[PDB]
Amino acid sequence: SDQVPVGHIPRSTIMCRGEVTRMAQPGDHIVVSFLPLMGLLFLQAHRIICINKNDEISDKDPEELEELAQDDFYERLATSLAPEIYGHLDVKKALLLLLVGGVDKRPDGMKIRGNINICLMGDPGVAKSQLLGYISRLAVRSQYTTGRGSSGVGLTAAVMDPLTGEMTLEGGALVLADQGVCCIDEFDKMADQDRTAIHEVMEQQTISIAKAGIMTTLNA
Amino acid sequence: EGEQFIKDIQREYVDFLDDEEDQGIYAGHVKDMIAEKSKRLIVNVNDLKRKNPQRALGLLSNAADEQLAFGRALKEYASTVDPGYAKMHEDLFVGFRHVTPRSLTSIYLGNMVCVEGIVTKVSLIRPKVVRSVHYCPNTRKVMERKYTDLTSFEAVPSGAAYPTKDEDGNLLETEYGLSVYKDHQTLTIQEMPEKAPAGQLPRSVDIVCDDDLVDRCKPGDRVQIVGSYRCLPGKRGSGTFRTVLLANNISLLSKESLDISREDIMLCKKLAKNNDIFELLSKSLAPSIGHVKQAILCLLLGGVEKILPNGTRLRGDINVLLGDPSAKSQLLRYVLNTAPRAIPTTGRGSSGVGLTAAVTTDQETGERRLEAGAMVLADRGVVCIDEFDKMSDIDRTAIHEVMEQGRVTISKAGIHASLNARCSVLAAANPVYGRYDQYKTPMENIGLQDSLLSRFDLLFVMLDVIDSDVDQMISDHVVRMHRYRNPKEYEKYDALLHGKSRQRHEKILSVEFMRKYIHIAKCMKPKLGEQACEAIANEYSRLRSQEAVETDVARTQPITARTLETLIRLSTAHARARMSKSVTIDDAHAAIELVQFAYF
Amino acid sequence: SANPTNIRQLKSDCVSKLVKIAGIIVAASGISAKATRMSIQCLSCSTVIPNLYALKCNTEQAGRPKCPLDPFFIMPDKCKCVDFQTLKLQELPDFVPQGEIPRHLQLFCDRSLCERVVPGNRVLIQGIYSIRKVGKEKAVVGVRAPYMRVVGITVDSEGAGAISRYTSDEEEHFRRMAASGDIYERLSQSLAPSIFGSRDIKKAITCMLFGGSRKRLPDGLCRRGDINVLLLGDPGTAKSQLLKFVEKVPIAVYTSGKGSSTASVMKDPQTRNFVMEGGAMVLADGGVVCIDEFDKMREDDRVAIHEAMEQQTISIAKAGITTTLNSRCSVLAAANSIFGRWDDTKGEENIDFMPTILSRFDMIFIVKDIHDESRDITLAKHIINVHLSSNKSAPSEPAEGEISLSTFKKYIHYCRTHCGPRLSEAPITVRQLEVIRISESLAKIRLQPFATDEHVNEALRLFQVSTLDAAM
DNA sequence: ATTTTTTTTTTTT
Numbered sequence A: 001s002d003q004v005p006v007g008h009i010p011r012s013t014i015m016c017r018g019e020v021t022r023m024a025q026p027g028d029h030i031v032v033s034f035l036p037l038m039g040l041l042f043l044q045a046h047r048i049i050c051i052n053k054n055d056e057i058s059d060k061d062p063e064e065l066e067e068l069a070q071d072d073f074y075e076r077l078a079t080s081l082a083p084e085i086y087g088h089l090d091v092k093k094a095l096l097l098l099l100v101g102g103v104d105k106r107p108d109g110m111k112i113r114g115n116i117n118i119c120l121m122g123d124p125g126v127a128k129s130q131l132l133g134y135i136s137r138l139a140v141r142s143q144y145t146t147g148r149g150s151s152g153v154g155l156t157a158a159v160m161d162p163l164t165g166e167m168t169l170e171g172g173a174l175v176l177a178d179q180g181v182c183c184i185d186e187f188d189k190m191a192d193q194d195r196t197a198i199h200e201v202m203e204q205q206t207i208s209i210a211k212a213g214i215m216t217t218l219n220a
Numbered sequence B: 001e002g003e004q005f006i007k008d009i010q011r012e013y014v015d016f017l018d019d020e021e022d023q024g025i026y027a028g029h030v031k032d033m034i035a036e037k038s039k040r041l042i043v044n045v046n047d048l049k050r051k052n053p054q055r056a057l058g059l060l061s062n063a064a065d066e067q068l069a070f071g072r073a074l075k076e077y078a079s080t081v082d083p084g085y086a087k088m089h090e091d092l093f094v095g096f097r098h099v100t101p102r103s104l105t106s107i108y109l110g111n112m113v114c115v116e117g118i119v120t121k122v123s124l125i126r127p128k129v130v131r132s133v134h135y136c137p138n139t140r141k142v143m144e145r146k147y148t149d150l151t152s153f154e155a156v157p158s159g160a161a162y163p164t165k166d167e168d169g170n171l172l173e174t175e176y177g178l179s180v181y182k183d184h185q186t187l188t189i190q191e192m193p194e195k196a197p198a199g200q201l202p203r204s205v206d207i208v209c210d211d212d213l214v215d216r217c218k219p220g221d222r223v224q225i226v227g228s229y230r231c232l233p234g235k236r237g238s239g240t241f242r243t244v245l246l247a248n249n250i251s252l253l254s255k256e257s258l259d260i261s262r263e264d265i266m267l268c269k270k271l272a273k274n275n276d277i278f279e280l281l282s283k284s285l286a287p288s289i290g291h292v293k294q295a296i297l298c299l300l301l302g303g304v305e306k307i308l309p310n311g312t313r314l315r316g317d318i319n320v321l322l323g324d325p326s327a328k329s330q331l332l333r334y335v336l337n338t339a340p341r342a343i344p345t346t347g348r349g350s351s352g353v354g355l356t357a358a359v360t361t362d363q364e365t366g367e368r369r370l371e372a373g374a375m376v377l378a379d380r381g382v383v384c385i386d387e388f389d390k391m392s393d394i395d396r397t398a399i400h401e402v403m404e405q406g407r408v409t410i411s412k413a414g415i416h417a418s419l420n421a422r423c424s425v426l427a428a429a430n431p432v433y434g435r436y437d438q439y440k441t442p443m444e445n446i447g448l449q450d451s452l453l454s455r456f457d458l459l460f461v462m463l464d465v466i467d468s469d470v471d472q473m474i475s476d477h478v479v480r481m482h483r484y485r486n487p488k489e490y491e492k493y494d495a496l497l498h499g500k501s502r503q504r505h506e507k508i509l510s511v512e513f514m515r516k517y518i519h520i521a522k523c524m525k526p527k528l529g530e531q532a533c534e535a536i537a538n539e540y541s542r543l544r545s546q547e548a549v550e551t552d553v554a555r556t557q558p559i560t561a562r563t564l565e566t567l568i569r570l571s572t573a574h575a576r577a578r579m580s581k582s583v584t585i586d587d588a589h590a591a592i593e594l595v596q597f598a599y600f
Numbered sequence C: 001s002a003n004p005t006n007i008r009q010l011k012s013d014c015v016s017k018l019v020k021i022a023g024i025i026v027a028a029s030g031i032s033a034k035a036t037r038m039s040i041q042c043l044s045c046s047t048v049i050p051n052l053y054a055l056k057c058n059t060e061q062a063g064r065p066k067c068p069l070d071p072f073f074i075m076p077d078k079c080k081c082v083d084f085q086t087l088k089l090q091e092l093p094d095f096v097p098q099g100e101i102p103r104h105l106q107l108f109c110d111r112s113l114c115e116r117v118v119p120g121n122r123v124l125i126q127g128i129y130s131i132r133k134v135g136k137e138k139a140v141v142g143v144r145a146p147y148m149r150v151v152g153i154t155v156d157s158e159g160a161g162a163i164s165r166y167t168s169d170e171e172e173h174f175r176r177m178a179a180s181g182d183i184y185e186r187l188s189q190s191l192a193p194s195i196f197g198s199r200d201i202k203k204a205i206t207c208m209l210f211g212g213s214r215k216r217l218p219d220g221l222c223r224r225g226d227i228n229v230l231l232l233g234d235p236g237t238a239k240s241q242l243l244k245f246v247e248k249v250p251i252a253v254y255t256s257g258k259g260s261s262t263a264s265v266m267k268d269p270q271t272r273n274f275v276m277e278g279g280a281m282v283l284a285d286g287g288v289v290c291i292d293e294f295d296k297m298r299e300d301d302r303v304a305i306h307e308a309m310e311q312q313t314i315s316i317a318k319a320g321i322t323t324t325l326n327s328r329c330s331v332l333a334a335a336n337s338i339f340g341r342w343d344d345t346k347g348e349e350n351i352d353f354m355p356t357i358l359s360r361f362d363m364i365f366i367v368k369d370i371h372d373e374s375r376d377i378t379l380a381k382h383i384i385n386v387h388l389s390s391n392k393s394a395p396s397e398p399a400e401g402e403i404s405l406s407t408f409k410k411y412i413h414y415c416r417t418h419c420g421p422r423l424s425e426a427p428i429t430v431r432q433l434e435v436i437r438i439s440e441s442l443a444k445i446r447l448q449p450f451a452t453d454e455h456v457n458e459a460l461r462l463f464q465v466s467t468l469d470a471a472m
Numbered sequence D: 001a002t003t004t005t006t007t008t009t010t011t012t013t
């Protein structure tokens, strides 16, 4: 969609056999390295390279040692984390803590919520739109929804009508952002009925949907 | 080799290829050394009538077989001159009475003729394949069998699957990269409906296309397209008859091209030093209109783009509307008609802003309608609508989305998509109590919502009273309208004076001269100097400090610094109205009077 | 082509026999294609066919080799060609189509006879009594289907309908009557050839149909030359019959609410096409309409009211496109809207969605059932002559020049094509003024080029009927 | 896969 013409619609077939399988996931920005298929009216690949969202660009999926010996600091992150705005060291560093992570225990059968869940209310010249966009950009496995918008409603998945027959739970942003962050904007305007959806999902890894007759988890 | 007349046909065609027409005009270093490879050397029948009129008819009476021969003549010539344009020995078609789609009466079969109409049901792409390039890894001979269909010639092979085990039962296998293929397309045509008769249901037509002829436009446009006829299938030995017309070239008519070589840029550079052309330029959207328009300048000009190194970018656009009822529904028209592809919409409608929701509950074909958006045609365009006061609150959300981002992001089972848009849009108005504007209150005499302060980009004033002093002034200008409307100021000639005491001239006051500075004007990049920041900072400080007081505080709702983006990127649109590679203190002055007219 | 037949009597007994019958046409197809002959590579012989099966190979005699099982690849550039329409009609309206259902026939056009006939017509024809299938869980034994052919159509052209599809003395009648300066208010007893009232409002129809002027300019606009009216009041004033009888008086239709509208982006039977019918700005581009019950109609088809009355800013997006058709339309309006003159004189609360409806139109004169006891008994007995005896066909025919439907419609449909008339040098706000259409109108009402302000402020004095409704 | 239908939920001032 970065090369699709203004007056056009993004169009989409890949066939790979053998060992190459399982080398991409739904929704990966990939490079792929032509044969028609028997009025005389698809593609076979070998490799899946992604300069974005791939093994050496992704986190957790030594090389830095020459610089790591040179680099021992905690504050320069703010100097290089979102230089776009002057001041506001604290808000950035608070998010840098959310970028930090590294807190967890699984004692006695139960886990502990080990992800930071920050909320923010306020609206002047604050420009808190460039921050969420900044985080959603740099943050590996990122997401974005709004207060409502369309086909999502800054939520998880729902079996909400008279269209056809599928029962497609349709996992949205809140579904998919796990092991990551789903960065909603203007949550206050989202909905009153919606607040219960953030209630059971707050704790962690828990979104039950007893509407179709299934124990859906979705591991929030 | 048919009957041997084909050869003299070839030679009669090649007799075009020798002298000043050929040597000066036609091909060679007019297409080929410009390195295009788009075969089609454009033909005009009237020359064929002039040299060989019998061969001006060999087409129109039997269009089955002039054609391989045309290709022969061409490939012979270009091979004779250029072995570079020679390794693509193919058909190589070329360019070359218009009746309606309602007016094909069994005939024109064999004829290369014109019909006019609409594009609709532009469809999928398919390849189609030319030959079979076989090799025998036992005996290792790259052999071949061409294919064909009626859609090019009369000849067809045993058109079927790849052959094998036919030569000997040897080691027998295909190869690819060698058996080439053809770009195939299909769609249908409707007449232009304004003519249409009320009693009948109009006919469509069906056509086919080919290689370099693939769809530079869209279903629901109109272009002149020329075609021959064939009809392949049977009629009840089988099943009855149905046809198509084909063998085509292309045009396009409803555009502007633009007698525009590098002279017209010389013109735009000629009137440059004329300083306050701003005046006429603002009198270039109100000849029939008081008031503003110097502000609509930038929404005509779109905006500017700026990106951080090793980062991201900014949405750039401007959107404003305001007053009392009775110029609003006959003002917007100025920008439906003039500035490229800027599309108003309904005001209270859906199924066409951005929404799909797989609405195929009729035919239920392959496609599930993944495209029902008419605001992404506003990508780098302009829009206006009515009913804003009546607008749904479904989209006020969606516009909160847009103004912040200007991208759509929907995943309602078609797909989890997102698509660029760089747009702007306008509005309507209705205060539920009329002539209450400030005395009762400034804001919310109107019937509105106040999340949208910083998301449009100016607050202005529009007001009315029928009067005592302006009573006779209204009278005399309405009359001067009514007869400067009219000639000598057919059914109606030209009206000049009071455009003559005004020392302009409608070929300096004109549309093409107006957009003289658009199309290169909309391609410049005039960076800032050393001066804005200071005064804009002091005066935005004064704006954010003292604009909220002294009987105008209640009319001082939108103070944010998100105006300061607007406060400056308007002087950008102004700075691309004159090609000055800077912006100035004079532009500073000219980019604050917005503030004064808002209330001052 | 003598003497007709019917359809409820014709079977095997009269098969392959040529007949005269009559009905009323419904709709039918376009024209596609046909041919008679061509030839093939395989034998290179003309495709000689009797009727308007499929074969020996004959790509054989190359020594021994045969090639049976039919390699016959048609070469249509060798061919011939004919026409088709495939027509259809419904049987009579007098021969029990009520307690039964109407049966019908399928047809076959050939060369020259298409583009001749559109439905809404009544015809006499000859044909052929043939069928299409072959024989003996459909067809429990052998059932088959009906059709006929085309031969020797002869249509009916019934008399005085057809200045629809198919003198200078009358111009003398036009003009030497037009010289009389007695047409403006003379015809205030004309458009109601059987009714009393609306007299000085018939004074304002005199400008309406003649139109104003689409005086376009060197810059963009094509502004609203067209003009409209509004009326309003309770039932009992015969405002139904006022629009019903007006149907015959240039092009119009008279239905209101839940029963055209927008486009017809649906399919047909024929290789599942999708082709449209348009709107009714289509059917009104110089023609105009008289239409009741704005309020008592679906709220869907009300974005196309502001999208035509204000600008003619029309557009579509059903399939992904804006068929941007336009038209020179205007409308008369009627209603039984909320609470009559007790509502009208006082302020503005009629429609609960917009005050917009007073802006774009000007002449809104009230319909009442006012009590006036001197006339209440008259209108109590203005309704027994109407109720009884079926006499009043042409009682207005004797009038000097307030009749002759044909000549009047032609009067107009010359008049609205004279030139670019204008006027002279010569709450009264901007849309009272933007009446100027009526000013220019009296040029074409006197059939003159020019006119002045205040002789033609006759319209002003008539508008003072309306402005008193919503002055206050 | 569409045509001729019907409710049971999906989510409510």
Ligand SMILES: Nc1ncnc2c1ncn2[C@@H]1O[C@H](COP(=O)(O)OP(=O)(O)OP(=O)(O)O)[C@@H](O)[C@H]1O
Residues within 6 Å of the ligand: B288, B289, B290, B291, B325, B326, B327, B328, B329, B330, B331, B429, C430, C431, C434
């Ligand atoms: N200063 C002016 N310049 C040009 N025309 C004017 C001016 N003042 C009044 N008019 C005329 O008055 C008419 C007012 O009705 P108009 O068509 O403008 O409604 P509208 O303003 O479009 O309503 P809305 O803006 O709410 O849609 C306009 O047609 C316009 O021609």
Ligand SMILES: Nc1ncnc2c1ncn2[C@@H]1O[C@H](COP(=O)(O)OP(=O)(O)O)[C@@H](O)[C@H]1O
Residues within 6 Å of the ligand: A084, A085, A086, A087, A123, A124, A125, A126, A127, A128, A129, A130, B561, B562, B565
């Ligand atoms: N401290 C700051 N540094 C840089 N830019 C700022 C700062 N404060 C405001 N801005 C401006 O704010 C704009 C973004 O505002 P935004 O954050 O969208 O407001 P909101 O968060 O209310 O949506 C940017 O264009 C930027 O120029």
Ligand SMILES: Nc1ncnc2c1ncn2[C@@H]1O[C@H](COP(=O)(O)OP(=O)(O)O)[C@@H](O)[C@H]1O
Residues within 6 Å of the ligand: C195, C196, C234, C235, C236, C237, C238, C239, C240, C241, C242, C336, C379, C382, C383, C386, C387
């Ligand atoms: N002056 C009149 N002359 C003849 N008939 C009248 C008159 N006034 C009322 N009517 C009666 O009014 C009836 C029609 O009312 P109608 O126009 O249908 O009301 P609406 O227009 O609200 O439907 C007719 O049947 C007619 O008999």
